[PDB]
Amino acid sequence: SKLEGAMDALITVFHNYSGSEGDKYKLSKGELKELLNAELTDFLMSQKDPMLVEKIMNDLDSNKDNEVDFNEFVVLVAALTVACNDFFQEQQKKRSK
Amino acid sequence: SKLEGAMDALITVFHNYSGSEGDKYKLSKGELKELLNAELTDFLMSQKDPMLVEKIMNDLDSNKDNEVDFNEFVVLVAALTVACNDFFQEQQKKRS
Numbered sequence: 218s219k220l221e222g223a224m225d226a227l228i229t230v231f232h233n234y235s236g237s238e239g240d241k242y243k244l245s246k247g248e249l250k251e252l253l254n255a256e257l258t259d260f261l262m263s264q265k266d267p268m269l270v271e272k273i274m275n276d277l278d279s280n281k282d283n284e285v286d287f288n289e290f291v292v293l294v295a296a297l298t299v300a301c302n303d304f305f306q307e308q309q310k311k312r313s314k
Numbered sequence: 315s316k317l318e319g320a321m322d323a324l325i326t327v328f329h330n331y332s333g334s335e336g337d338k339y340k341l342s343k344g345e346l347k348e349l350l351n352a353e354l355t356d357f358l359m360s361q362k363d364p365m366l367v368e369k370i371m372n373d374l375d376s377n378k379d380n381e382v383d384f385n386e387f388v389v390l391v392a393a394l395t396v397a398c399n400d401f402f403q404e405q406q407k408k409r410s
């Protein structure tokens with residue numbers, strides 16, 4: 218199914234970056250930065266934005282273990298997907314006026 | 315990017331079922347049923363299970379407007395993906 222394909226992909230993406238160092242199933246700041254730069258580059262306007270990454274790391278690491286675990290990563294993905302969905306919807310609503 | 319491809323897919327799937335009736339951007343119980351049966355059938359052990367769909371509807375519709383909006387739908391997707399990831403990680407741990 219298209220949905221479970223997407224779910225599989227969320228899992229794969231995470232594990233593509235989380236296994237370079239430290240906990241194999243959590244993202245370090247470095248691994249997160251890597252993932253942001255390669256996977257969400259449009260959100261960084263294809264710029265390097267370390268201070269922004271720092272803030273993303275701080276907002277996502279809710280339990281303060283200096284890692285972004287999978288639950289924490291999914292919080293990111295959910296927020297950015299909702300925001301994009303909302304964008305597309307408002308663009309259609311604006312058009313129908 | 316693989317990630318943004320997946321995010322796009324989440325949006326497209328929801329909008330694939332949400333536009334049959336009512337709000338074009340929310341799932342009725344009926345629309346949610348169609349989505350669950352087409353997209354998550356393995357979670358239903360490939361059975362039709364309207365009693366479980368009812369409970370799923372009731373759980374996802376946190377604002378009690380009788381619809382599952384996109385945010386509500388992503389709560390389900392997050393929960394299921396997290397559970398699936400946990401499964402795959404515990405299967406690896408077990409193996410070692």
Ligand SMILES: [Ca+2]
Binds near residue numbers: 235240
């Ligand atoms: Ca790691």
Ligand SMILES: [Ca+2]
Binds near residue numbers: 278279284289
């Ligand atoms: Ca954390």
Ligand SMILES: [Ca+2]
Binds near residue numbers: 331339345
């Ligand atoms: Ca609808």
Ligand SMILES: [Ca+2]
Binds near residue numbers: 374379381
């Ligand atoms: Ca609702």
